[PDB]
């Protein structure tokens, strides 16, 4: 209940555009690795053959409000440079569908 409804920020280097930082809602898992949604890999440009990411924690009320309103992943779907969708089915999903 401490980590309930407390967002965190995930970052991968290089940060080439805005969508290199996004805010999620943490869940407790078993293991020593972070689990990432399949649909944000296009924005992060992250495969799964050895990449690493960093975590940051907002503290005050304004920082939490900004993370929850401005930066949430489900609010940033369209690319800001061309207006095309980024969180789209690709690879395995395209073959299945």
């Amino acid at each position: 209940e401490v980590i309930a409804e407390h967002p965190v920020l995930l970052n991968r280097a290089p940060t080439l555009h805005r969508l290199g930082i996004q805010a999620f809602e943490p869940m407790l898992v078993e293991g020593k690795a972070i689990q990432l949604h399949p649909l944000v890999c296009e924005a992060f440009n992250a495969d799964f053959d050895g990449d690493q990411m960093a975590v940051h924690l907002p503290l005050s009320a304004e920082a939490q409000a900004e993370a929850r309103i401005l930066m949430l992943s489900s609010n940033n779907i369209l690319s800001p440079a061309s207006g095309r969708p980024l969180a789209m089915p690709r690879l395995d999903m395209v073959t299945g569908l």
Partner: peptide
């Protein structure tokens, strides 16, 4: 450099939601 930060290896989880 900042406090309250961490690092680890990312892996795929297909049971999660977009948030």
């Amino acid at each position: 450099r900042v406090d309250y930060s961490g690092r680890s290896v990312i892996v795929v989880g297909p049971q999660l939601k977009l948030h």
